[PDB]
A paper describes a structure:
The nucleosome contains a conserved cluster of negatively charged residues in histones H2A and H2B, known as the nucleosome acidic patch, that is a hotspot for interactions with proteins that regulate transcription, the cell cycle, and the DNA damage response. Our results suggest a mechanism by which H2BK120ub serves as a gatekeeper to the acidic patch and point to distinct roles for histone H2AK119 and H2BK120 ubiquitination in regulating protein binding to nucleosomes.
To see if this methyl modification affects H2BK120ub positioning on the nucleosome surface, we determined cryoEM structures of a nucleosome containing H2BK120ub, di-methylated histone H3-K79 (H3KC79me2), and Widom 601 DNA with 19 bp linkers (185 bp). The cryoEM dataset revealed two additional distinct ubiquitin positions on the nucleosome surface, denoted H2Bub positions 5 and 6. The global resolution estimates for these EM maps were 2.93 and 3.06 Å, respectively, with a local resolution of ∼2.5 Å for the nucleosome core and ∼5 Å for ubiquitin. The density corresponding to ubiquitin in positions 5 and 6 was sufficiently well-resolved to unambiguously orient the ubiquitin with its beta sheet oriented towards the nucleosome surface. As observed for H2Bub positions 1 and 2, the ubiquitin in positions 5 and 6 occludes large portions of the nucleosome acidic patch. At a probe radius of 5 Å, the occluded surface area between the acidic patch and ubiquitin in H2Bub positions 5 and 6 is 890 Å2 and 1119 Å2, respectively. We built the H2BK120ub nucleosome system with the initial ubiquitin position at H2Bub position 5, which is approximately halfway between H2Bub positions 2 and 3. Importantly, the ubiquitin primarily sampled conformations near the acidic patch and the distance between the ubiquitin and acidic patch largely remained within 1 Å of the starting ubiquitin position. Our cryoEM maps unexpectedly showed ubiquitin positioned on the nucleosome in multiple distinct locations that occlude the nucleosome acidic patch, particularly H2Bub positions 1, 2, and 5.
Author numbering:
A (entry chain K): 1 to 74
B (entry chain C): 16 to 118
C (entry chain F): 25 to 102
D (entry chain D): 28 to 122
E (entry chain E): 39 to 135
F (entry chain A): 38 to 134
G (entry chain B): 20 to 102
H (entry chain G): 14 to 118
DNA sequence: CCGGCAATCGATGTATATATCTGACACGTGCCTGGAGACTAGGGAGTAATCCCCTTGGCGGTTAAAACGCGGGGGACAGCGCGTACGTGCGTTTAAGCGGTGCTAGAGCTGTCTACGACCAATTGAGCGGCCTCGGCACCGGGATTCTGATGGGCGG
DNA sequence: CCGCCCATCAGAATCCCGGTGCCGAGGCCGCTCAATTGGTCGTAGACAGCTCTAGCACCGCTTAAACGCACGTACGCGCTGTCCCCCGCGTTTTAACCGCCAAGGGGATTACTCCCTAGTCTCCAGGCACGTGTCAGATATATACATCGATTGCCGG
């Protein structure tokens, strides 16, 4: 399904990622479509820092979600 | 500060002061303000996340009381918690009984 | 001054309540129930104001009265 | 112009944590302040009653935990208990 | 042309369930509040916020009462609300003895 | 053969049970039900007899009040028989989810 | 010992007696099951609160004071069993 | 006079009420007249309820008051019914009341 | 251990009101619960009143306002009269 | 010559009167813990003065909402017929209730000692009040899209 | 051949889009007061141990309540007709809302003092635990009265 990811520059990107796909897969797809290194990417959903060892379904990410970049929570 | 040690955003010292000057008990333990601040922060985060989603649905970038009302009334646990609370300038959920609809 | 709560206003309140057809004897009942509710709340608020030795009724007194009656209200300084 | 305290800055910090690009108005801020105060009073009163029942002179984290379990419904209580326990453990570990 | 009965009623239901404005004029409510207060104690003053809060609470109470009244009217296989429905709702709620 | 018409013994029972004060439910079944329900939250639990007594009193009072409201709702619909819809309407208007 | 099927111990005559004390003359045949469900929900809530109260005190026995405190929390004050 | 109740001319205890107020976590300080006021109010309410219950007991040709008499006293008074609106009395019962539509014609 | 209750004072009031009627054991328990409940209600209302006005003491004014807020219409008048009479008698002596 | 209405008559259920015994209530006794008395120290609250902010009152306009009336369609209500579900009674079955017996886990109390919370003093940064600036949202005008109800038509009893 | 059901048109009503502007939200700066740190001290509570009470389990016997079945009747539900009363729309009236001005009452702050409350110590008496007698009330039995439903007589159609 298609998710919206927003960067610090206000750019909105559409990602076609399955719910069972891991966060590392999302980072790989973002790098493929944008060139941003996965280690330089920090995605967040529901005010939580996503971990590459989990999947979209682990974070209960549903359709038409919104993700943000860089912001860290600790 | 104590919030920094606890890794929180809400104030621990202020909560401790409010507990000590509220006529609740003779003494207050060291971890009670930390526990209370963590719980308050969690509840605030939940409500704010729902309200922000409601604001995004309306194509708005600012939260108004209507969004808070829509967030609270559409969640079962939040509706149970705030069951006897009136939010000013909130409104109601759109709902029409099926008998009144035209055939 | 109870007649200042006109019939169109009551109809608008009913519309927000989800009501389609309204009988002609509903407006008097609505006026009565509103008067009773206001009487209770204002009595409590004036008691609160009198305890503080003030000649002006403030919003805090109204909020305290409503909380006493069991109807918490958010957004007015509570 | 006496100083008046509120939860506005902390609520704004939490909001910027959950939704990085989203604002808030003054009326919504007032509603949030009232909500935080109300929940505070409820939990504190329940804990005070719990301490009175068992003949104790102090309020501890056990009283707060039991009050949260008594007041919050269902999954809310579970997640709140987890958050409070994590915060207390983190505070104790650091010094 | 002319709309059939019940159409504009549904339009009003839809349009008043999506707004948040107050549905009662301010001057009549202020006058009513002042006279009710003068029943108890005379030479009393009001903040504007007090009248605003009173109006908000009153409108919320009346809207909830009308929801319950509509439910009671539907239970009796009717679409028109009547004073007996209001009385039944108030009695079951506990306000009426 | 002597025989009463329908509704007579019902009125006699209404008069008899509205003047007494004893409990209307057997004690052993209620005790068993309470223990089974409490088994879900925590095992190996013991009860005082007073606790079960208080639970029974509260439950019976709650049910009697609910039946009064149900009778009112049934009468509102021009009926003398109570149906599950009356219970549902009473609970909904009271505010019990 | 785990026991089940105890909701059926609330027999139909008992529900009829409760309805008679409530003032009801005629009862439909589908009322008993709904009454059982309502009673089960009420008991579940009260017992949950009472068991929480008992657990906080580090006791293995539920007392009448726990029941009274629970009922007061649910907004149903009860006179007679202490307090 | 020696005790505070005798000075106030009451039956309820003033010293015990003062002690309960001072240790109930209500306020930092407690004034001198607050226990007297509270004791007087409690005594008045007790007297009202007991008078009504004793009349109810005398109606049933009884000498002792039982919870049924207290329930009859409370439920038949408007102000007492308003005050004890959400209170359950053990072994009390209900007021006899049958709707008019259910009576035979 | 010693357990305190209101039984003796309730019995004295009852003998003042009905000088021949008695009372059972469950009725006295109900009376004890009633007295305790009213005590807690009035005390809590007075404490909240003191908190609102930024005061650290509870006086007879707080009790009077609390019984005016809590008690219904005609009960409050007689309760206020009784409390005022008791306070005046205590102060004069 | 039958029906509805009205006045009897037997059966059943409930309240009333009279011993009878018992278990709970009312009263008497000892003691120990909490209340009363006397005094001292200190801060919470009352009192007076000042200032300015906000509440009250009045006047003018304009305009949208309220009030009034009318025509009509749809809903509320009443009567009638039918059929089935619930009440009343009887015979059979079951388990609740009572009365013992035994046993054990736990609630309740006591002594000790120790880690934790209160209190105090000095330091310092976080949070509040005030000012500015720009962008999200209110406003207005125009076109697009969507129900809604009348109109024409077709069809089958 | 005509009443009922179905496809198709214009016309209000709501929404979306684009340009304009404007006021509130978000960021920056100075200061002061409350939170942090470090040390001392007293006691609240944890912990161990002992005692004895009440909660749990089991067995036997009586009997009242529950359960299953049959029959019949009265109530619930659906249909039909009427009739009236609320809804939708057009015209006229009114008062609400906005803007502006003026005046003064009272809410909020501050300085000062003093008197009411807390804390300490001593003494003693009232309330609580315990024990005991007796009488209000439950129990059993007999009896009188009220009500309910079937029976039958009577005025009238």
């Amino acid at each position: 399904m298609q998710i919206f990811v927003k960067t610090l520059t206000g750019k909105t990107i559409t990602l076609e990622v399955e719910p069972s796909d891991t966060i590392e897969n999302v980072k790989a797809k973002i790098q493929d479509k944008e060139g941003i290194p996965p280690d330089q990417q920090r995605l967040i959903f529901a005010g939580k820092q996503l971990e590459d060892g989990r999947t979209l379904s682990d974070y209960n990410i549903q359709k038409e979600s919104t993700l943000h970049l860089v912001l860290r929570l600790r | 500060t104590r919030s920094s040690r606890a890794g929180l955003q809400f104030p621990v010292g202020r909560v401790h002061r409010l507990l000590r000057k509220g006529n609740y008990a003779e003494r207050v333990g060291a971890g009670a303000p930390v526990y209370l601040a963590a719980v308050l922060e969690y509840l605030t985060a939940e409500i704010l996340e729902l309200a922000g989603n409601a604001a995004r649905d309306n194509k708005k970038t600012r939260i108004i009381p209507r969004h808070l009302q829509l967030a609270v009334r559409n969640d079962e646990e939040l509706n149970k918690l705030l069951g006897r609370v009136t939010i000013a300038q909130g409104g109601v959920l759109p709902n029409i009984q099926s008998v009144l609809l035209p055939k | 001054n109870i007649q200042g709560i006109t019939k169109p206003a009551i109809r608008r309140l009913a519309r927000r309540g989800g009501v389609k057809r309204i009988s002609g004897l509903i407006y008097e009942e609505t006026r009565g129930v509103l008067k009773v509710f206001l009487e209770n709340v204002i009595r409590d608020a004036v008691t609160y104001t009198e305890h503080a030795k003030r000649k002006t009724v403030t919003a805090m007194d109204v909020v305290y009265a409503l909380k006493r009656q069991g109807r918490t209200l958010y957004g007015f300084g509570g | 112009k006496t100083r008046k305290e509120s939860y506005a800055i902390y609520v704004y910090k939490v909001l910027k944590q959950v939704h990085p690009d989203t604002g808030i108005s003054s009326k919504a801020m007032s509603i949030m302040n009232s909500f935080v105060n109300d929940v505070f009073e409820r939990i504190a009163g329940e804990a005070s009653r719990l301490a009175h029942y068992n003949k104790r002179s102090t309020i501890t984290s056990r009283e707060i935990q039991t009050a949260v379990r008594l007041l919050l419904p269902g999954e809310l209580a579970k997640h709140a208990v987890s958050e409070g326990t994590k915060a207390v453990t983190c505070y104790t570990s650091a010094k | 042309h002319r709309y059939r009965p019940g159409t504009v009623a549904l339009r009003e239901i839809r349009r008043y369930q999506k707004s948040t404005e107050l549905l009662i004029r301010k001057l009549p409510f202020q006058r009513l509040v002042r006279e009710i207060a003068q029943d108890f104690k005379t030479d009393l003053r009001f903040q504007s916020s007090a009248v605003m809060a009173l109006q908000e609470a009153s409108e919320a109470y009346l809207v909830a009462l009308f929801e319950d009244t509509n439910l009671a009217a539907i239970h009796a296989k009717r679409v028109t609300i009547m004073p007996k429905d209001i009385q039944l709702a108030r009695r079951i709620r506990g306000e009426r003895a």
